[PDB]
Design a protein around this ligand. Structure first.
Ligand code: NAG
Ligand code: NAG
Ligand code: NAG
Ligand code: NAG
Ligand code: NAG
Ligand code: NAG
Ligand code: NAG
Lengths: 248, 596
């Protein structure tokens, strides 16, 4: 969609890998605000809504928290202290056609500055002066919606850069999408520290004869001591015992 | 509820609309210069009419805005140019006389004819036929006929047409609240709205004339020396007491005296500064010729060239059916699209021309951030002078040895520098009197206080006095030779060339001083100097947003037109010329002797 008709979608309850994004070797203005890309996977937040639109290469910098301008003020406003990342890459080879790609429109005028995270679609027209416009364009009507021109021979600054926006916020709800925490292969008959899904400890991992019902995760015997954990990647229950220790 | 905000709203709307139409028109023009087809010319009218018609509609809308309440100067200049009525003031019956007259004269000038009367053997166009027979031959008899082959076969029919052109183009000045059509061209240099920095339209004439008093003494010795070397091949055919014939100045109009190298070589014993055989030995091509120019620009400090030109523009002559002209020109299509149109060749001039072309392209991106209306030079002279400063540095031996085109061991003696400096003066200093007189003739003739009969007698009198040329054969008033020149005939302001010399050298001294180069200016270089690049970039990016007069103060600090930093470049040459002209008759008065 175009900048004046940017979409807001919902993504939740799954796992997304941002590591592949970093080494995509295709992004030109991968910028993160309020969070480093490296620590974006270990910790996860809610409100992972995403936005998609097309922005010309020259005015890419306008899309940033605390940054105003034409697109940032009349088309899409980013709130201050924005917690998220913006990914942009060139799309010359496909987002362009001979004679000019007159398919993307943008807002050139507005009665008031756009508030952060506001979607504005309208047919009305601007009032430059005092005489109202009754739908007929005149000396002070200035139909705000103007179509972009993206020719294949346009300069790099004027090239239409394909850009998307990712945002993260807080809510009183369980955490939404996170990253996969690179589960490591197990080892048996060794005093090895373990960190399963939620619980962690140190002990010797051995075979077990007891049978768990299909809805348990870990087991304990006495005094809230965990001694039987079923790994999720194998669905096999294994005993846990503290390894050798004592006085000498 | 104010005019200032309303004007800003309109300008923003116009900027996005105008650039879109301009880009579509600009790209169409490039193709016609690379692939000419019978349908391409038909395409021009479809694109041209709407683009021109677009400005007409916008100009009317901008007229109702009063100009007495816009304190802002950025939009004040923009509204001034957008409100130029131009041909709108002319009536429909009178307006149709513009295109009808303009196009007919264009076709007439494009007809090359050197076929001998009563002897129709053959004759080619202007470029192949006219230039070769005058720039190479050394025969007085045929050259005189060649002089008459164009001033009596092409300009004769322009007398009833040119006169009609200046009577109706002079009327629009009153409708445009201007003094005359000549004064209209002076509006480019006019500055208003800034206290102390205002430049009156009439201030151009006095400033141009004031700087001409110091040019003449240099020209008196230059003309005295150049004429002395002309009688070596003509000891007695021309008397050494008057001026020189018009048809012995290299070109038909004598604008450039480059062709006089063979006849007037200062010291031909030692080899000249030529690297044509050097580059062919190393197998240079179009890509390498331009690439070495690009790294020269970035070394100075300016941003390097873009990426959408090598694979977008054309360098050599493509194909065989494509006969489109490839004259060296600068293309500014807008929206980040920039191209260069020229035919690469293994020649000295083309190598220098390559460095000259990128100068205009570099200036285009400097004011890219400026709006579409202000996306232009400060005045008509700035755009040309900016593109020539590097050409002077590119010809210096120091720059050539840096890349390796010149031999590693090339001594720099007295004669080596005088030979190089003198030729630059001929094509720069030599053409200054010719530029000034022609523009002065255009101003006075457009004023209207000149009867028909004395159009031509006054044209010749000052040429013999200022330029110093004797008429090869008397001509009566019916002839219209002054209208045969390319720029004057096709309605181009020739004053820009006169200011080109005064602008290129003023910046050269400032840039050379910024580089802290030790030595004379002729040996100065601009590369490997980041400080000089920053100084140039500061004024280039201003564009038309700031007054042109303010630009000068940012580089040389002199608000007026300073002619002093032009003799300094030729001080080694001037001293030698004075000694060489000890016996030559320096200083010519009115002279009817050669053709009494
Ligand atoms: C997912 O379950 C399949 C079921 O056989 C198993 O083969 C696979 O190893 C599991 N994934 C991981 C990462 O262990
Ligand atoms: C070039 O021009 C020729 C004829 O002038 C035409 O047949 C050909 O299609 C043109 N090619 C391009 C790429 O414009
Ligand atoms: C005029 O307005 C422009 C708006 O961008 C501003 O940049 C400039 O400084 C203003 N100049 C004056 C003299 O008010
Ligand atoms: C331009 O033409 C319009 C319409 O005739 C007129 O109102 C206006 O005064 C003219 N402006 C100039 C500068 O000639
Ligand atoms: C221009 O310089 C930049 C900065 O070093 C570089 O990335 C780019 O490739 C250069 N472009 C050309 C055409 O040399
Ligand atoms: C400029 O610097 C380069 C890099 O050292 C050098 O190769 C070149 O000869 C220098 N040119 C001049 C004129 O100093
Ligand atoms: C150049 O001229 C000066 C002044 O006469 C003289 O001293 C010097 O030797 C000359 N140099 C050469 C190389 O002729």
């Amino acid at each position: 969609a175009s900048v004046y008709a940017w979409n807001r979608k919902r993504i939740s309850n799954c796992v997304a890998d941002y590591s592949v994004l970093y080494n995509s070797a295709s992004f030109s203005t991968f910028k993160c605000y309020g969070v480093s890309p490296t620590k974006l996977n270990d910790l996860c937040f809610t409100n992972v809504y995403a936005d998609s639109f097309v922005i010309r290469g020259d005015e890419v910098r306008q899309i940033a928290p605390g940054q105003t301008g034409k697109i940032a003020d009349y088309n899409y406003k980013l709130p201050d202290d924005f917690t998220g990342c913006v990914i942009a890459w060139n799309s010359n080879n496909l987002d362009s056609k001979v004679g000019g790609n007159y398919n993307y429109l943008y807002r050139l005028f507005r009665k008031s500055n756009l508030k952060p995270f506001e979607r504005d679609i309208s047919t009305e027209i601007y009032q430059a002066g005092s005489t109202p416009c009754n739908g007929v364009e005149g000396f002070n009507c200035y139909f705000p919606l103007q179509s972009y021109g993206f020719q294949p021979t346009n300069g790099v600054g004027y090239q239409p850069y394909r850009v998307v926006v990712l945002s993260f916020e807080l809510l009183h709800a369980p955490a939404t999408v996170c990253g996969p925490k690179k589960s490591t292969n197990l080892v048996k008959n060794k005093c090895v520290n373990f960190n399963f899904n939620g619980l962690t400890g140190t002990g010797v991992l051995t075979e077990s004869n007891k049978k768990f019902l299909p809805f348990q995760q870990f087991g304990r015997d006495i005094a809230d001591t965990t001694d039987a954990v079923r790994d999720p990647q194998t669905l096999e229950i294994l005993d846990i015992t503290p390894c050798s220790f004592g006085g000498v | 509820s104010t005019i200032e905000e309303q004007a800003k709203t309109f300008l923003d709307k116009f900027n996005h609309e105008a650039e879109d139409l301009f880009y579509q028109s600009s790209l169409a023009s490039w193709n016609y210069n690379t692939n000419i087809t019978e349908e391409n010319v038909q395409n021009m009218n479809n694109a041209g009419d709407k683009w021109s018609a677009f400005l007409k509609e916008q100009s009317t809308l901008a007229q109702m805005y009063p100009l007495q309440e816009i304190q802002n100067l950025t939009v004040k200049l923009q509204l001034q140019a957008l409100q130029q009525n131009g041909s709108s003031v002319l009536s429909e019956d009178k307006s149709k006389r513009l295109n009808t007259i303009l196009n007919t004269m264009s076709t007439i000038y494009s007809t090359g004819k050197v076929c001998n009367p009563d002897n129709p053997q053959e004759c080619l166009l202007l470029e192949p036929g006219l230039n070769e027979i005058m720039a190479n031959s050394l025969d007085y008899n045929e050259r005189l006929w060649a002089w008459e082959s164009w001033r009596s076969e092409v300009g004769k029919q322009l007398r009833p047409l040119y006169e009609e052109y200046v009577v109706l183009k002079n009327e629009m000045a009153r409708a445009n609240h201007y003094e005359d059509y000549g004064d209209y061209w002076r509006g480019d240099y006019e500055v208003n709205g800034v206290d102390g920095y205002d430049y009156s339209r009439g201030q151009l004439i006095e400033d141009v004339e004031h700087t001409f008093e110091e040019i003449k003494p240099l020209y008196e010795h230059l003309h005295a020396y150049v004429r002395a070397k002309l009688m070596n091949a003509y000891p007695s055919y021309i008397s050494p007491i008057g001026c020189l014939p018009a048809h012995l100045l290299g070109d038909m109009w004598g604008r450039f005296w480059t062709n006089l190298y063979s006849l007037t070589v200062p010291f031909g014993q030692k080899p000249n500064i030529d690297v044509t055989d050097a580059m062919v030995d190393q197998a240079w091509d179009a890509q390498r010729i331009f690439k070495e120019a690009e790294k020269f620009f970035v070394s100075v400090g300016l941003p390097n060239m873009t990426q959408g030109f090598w694979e977008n523009s054309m360098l050599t002559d493509p194909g065989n059916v494509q006969k489109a002209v490839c004259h060296p020109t600068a293309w500014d299509l807008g929206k980040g699209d920039f191209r260069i149109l020229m035919c690469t060749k293994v020649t000295m001039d083309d190598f220098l021309t390559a460095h000259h072309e990128m100068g205009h392209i570099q200036y285009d991106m400097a004011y890219a951030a400026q709006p579409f209306l202000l996306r232009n030079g400060a005045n008509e002279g700035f755009h040309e002078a900016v593109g020539e400063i590097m050409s002077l540095s590119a010809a210096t031996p120091k720059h050539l040895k840096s890349i390796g085109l010149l031999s590693p061991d090339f001594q720099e003696d007295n004669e080596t520098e005088i030979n190089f400096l003198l030729k630059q003066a001929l094509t720069i200093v030599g053409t200054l009197p010719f530029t000034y007189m022609l523009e002065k003739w255009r101003w006075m003739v457009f004023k209207g206080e000149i009867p028909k009969d004395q159009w031509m007698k006054k044209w010749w009198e000052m040429k013999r006095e200022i330029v110093g040329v004797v008429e090869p054969v008397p001509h009566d008033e019916t002839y219209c030779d002054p209208a045969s020149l390319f720029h004057v005939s096709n309605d181009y302001s020739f004053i820009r060339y006169y200011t080109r010399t005064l602008y290129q050298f003023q910046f050269q001294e400032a840039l050379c001083q910024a580089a802290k180069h030790e030595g004379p200016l002729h040996k100065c270089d601009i590369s490997n100097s980041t400080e000089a690049g920053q100084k140039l970039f500061n004024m280039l990016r201003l564009g038309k947003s700031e007054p042109w007069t303010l630009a000068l103060e940012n580089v040389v600090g002199a608000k007026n037109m300073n002619v002093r930093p032009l003799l300094n470049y030729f001080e080694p040459l001037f001293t030698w010329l004075k000694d060489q002209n000890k016996n030559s008759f320096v200083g010519w008065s009115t002279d009817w002797s050669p053709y009494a």
